[PDB]
Amino acid sequence: KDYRKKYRKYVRSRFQCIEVSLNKRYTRLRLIKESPIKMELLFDPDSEPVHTVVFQGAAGIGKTILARKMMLDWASGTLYQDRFDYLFYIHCREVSLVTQRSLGDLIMSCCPDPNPPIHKIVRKPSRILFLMDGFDELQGAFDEHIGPLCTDWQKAERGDILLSSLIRKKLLPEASLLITTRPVALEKLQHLLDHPRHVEILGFSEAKRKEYFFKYFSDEAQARAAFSLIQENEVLFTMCFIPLVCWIVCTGLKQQMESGKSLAQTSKTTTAVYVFFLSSLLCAHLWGLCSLAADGIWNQKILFEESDLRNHGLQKADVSAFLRMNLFQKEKFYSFIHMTFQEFFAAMYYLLEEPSRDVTVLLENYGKFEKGYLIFVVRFLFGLVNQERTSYLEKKLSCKISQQIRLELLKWIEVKAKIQPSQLELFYCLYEMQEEDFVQRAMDYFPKIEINLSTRMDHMVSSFCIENCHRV
Ligand SMILES: Cc1ccc(C(F)(F)F)cc1Nc1nc(C(=O)NS(=O)(=O)N2CCCOCC2)co1
Ligand SMILES: Nc1ncnc2c1ncn2[C@@H]1O[C@H](COP(=O)(O)OP(=O)(O)O)[C@@H](O)[C@H]1O
Ligand SMILES: [Mg+2]
Numbered sequence: 001k002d003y004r005k006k007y008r009k010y011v012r013s014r015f016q017c018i019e020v021s022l023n024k025r026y027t028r029l030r031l032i033k034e035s036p037i038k039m040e041l042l043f044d045p046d047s048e049p050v051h052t053v054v055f056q057g058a059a060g061i062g063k064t065i066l067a068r069k070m071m072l073d074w075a076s077g078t079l080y081q082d083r084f085d086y087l088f089y090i091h092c093r094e095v096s097l098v099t100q101r102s103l104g105d106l107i108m109s110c111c112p113d114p115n116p117p118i119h120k121i122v123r124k125p126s127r128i129l130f131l132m133d134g135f136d137e138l139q140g141a142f143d144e145h146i147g148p149l150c151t152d153w154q155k156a157e158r159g160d161i162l163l164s165s166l167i168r169k170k171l172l173p174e175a176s177l178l179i180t181t182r183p184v185a186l187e188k189l190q191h192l193l194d195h196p197r198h199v200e201i202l203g204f205s206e207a208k209r210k211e212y213f214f215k216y217f218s219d220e221a222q223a224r225a226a227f228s229l230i231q232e233n234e235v236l237f238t239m240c241f242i243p244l245v246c247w248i249v250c251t252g253l254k255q256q257m258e259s260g261k262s263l264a265q266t267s268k269t270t271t272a273v274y275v276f277f278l279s280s281l282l283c284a285h286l287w288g289l290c291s292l293a294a295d296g297i298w299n300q301k302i303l304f305e306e307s308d309l310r311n312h313g314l315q316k317a318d319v320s321a322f323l324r325m326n327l328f329q330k331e332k333f334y335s336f337i338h339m340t341f342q343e344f345f346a347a348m349y350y351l352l353e354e355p356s357r358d359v360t361v362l363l364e365n366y367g368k369f370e371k372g373y374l375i376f377v378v379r380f381l382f383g384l385v386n387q388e389r390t391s392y393l394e395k396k397l398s399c400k401i402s403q404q405i406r407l408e409l410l411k412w413i414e415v416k417a418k419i420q421p422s423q424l425e426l427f428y429c430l431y432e433m434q435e436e437d438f439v440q441r442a443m444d445y446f447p448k449i450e451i452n453l454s455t456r457m458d459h460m461v462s463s464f465c466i467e468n469c470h471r472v
Contacts, residue, residue: 010112011075030202055180057201060244063180067133085127093137093302097160103153125172135181139300141370144191167192203241216250255280271383281325288313293345303333343376353398367420383432417445424451431461439468
């Protein structure tokens, strides 16, 4: 315990906030097993012991916020006090898959001091819980054929071999492991898991959506009026089960209240919501952000060093302006406030009017772990090429380029309609487009409707597309 106390102290300092006190704005999330699940009992059997737990969650659903909340509660003695002597937080986006490294090196880097008692930490592996946050955010490729597997926590291995050996339970077999990932990445992960317990993060319930708006707005009057807009807008109310969406919408309505204009948000698509957020912050640095984003996705870079920023014309003062308006975050290293914003600007890179800009090359890499699957680049590309879309940002886009891309997207649907993209995913893309002329032609390529629904947003998106089928 001599060093455990020093470590828990360091954990309560880093994970005190979400970077805003974590306990202040944290709002209970909904978890379901494989029924409601309780944190303390997460590693209890039914049977063999449960060493691996997998958290499936949508982008922005709150995987990282929940991992940080667990670090904090445990460090405070509220959670797993009797179970684990150590929790180590592994931020997958920082772990190179190429650099040779030892599990000891990895543990030591989670520690505050340079010379920790690593050999003591490892004496009781069953008392360790590894928290891998954002498996999908590993940069580069990653497949089940990796090998050979390592059984020595001191031996240095390529990052991919290291993580594979850890996930397969070859390294420290009886240590516990908690992985958070987006569902799409389970294609790769599933073949390594050993008797996993799968949990699903569902986000905010209707009552928790209200709670968030009230925790966000110090003034109750603002909270209740901001939430009234949501209640009135079927699409936003439904979409606000994603906590990230709650934060985007709340931050936007905040500006309107500072401007004094009567509150009103009429967004109908995710693209509309993300455009409503950026416009509220307002044009000179527009090209720079899209270049950086497109480069980051193509070359697998989430974290951007100052050399990359100056490389794309973003001077140090320009970056300080993004931090002020909460469009950038520093973590030396800079990154986008969320990966979805990096895909949004990457999509816009193909539509700006004066990395390759040939959309056909982009679509060839769709759904590949190596590039990050490109799920939201395509969704945002469908919504941005929408002719009906109008805004100060629409003028920066090229009508000619939008037309060429609109035509290629349609050829793309025709092939896929006759693996990823599923039919439901294409419904999300078509829902972003909205244009009935486009959607009606696209919907005719499908021989049959074949979908599986889980959420209200699934129902809404698929109802919109079914209604736009031809009727004899
Ligand atoms: C940020 C956001 C805004 C608005 C909406 C809403 F409008 F929809 F509410 C949803 C989200 N979040 C989100 N995350 C994923 C996500 O990560 N999906 S995925 O990659 O796992 N996938 C499912 C597995 C099969 O492949 C298809 C792709 C999809 O949507
Ligand atoms: N439980 C929560 N309470 C309050 N805000 C949340 C919560 N979960 C997510 N958020 C919001 O989402 C953002 C980060 O989401 P994140 O945890 O990174 O989701 P993911 O890791 O699944 O993308 C934060 O800025 C925060 O405002
Ligand atoms: Mg995350």
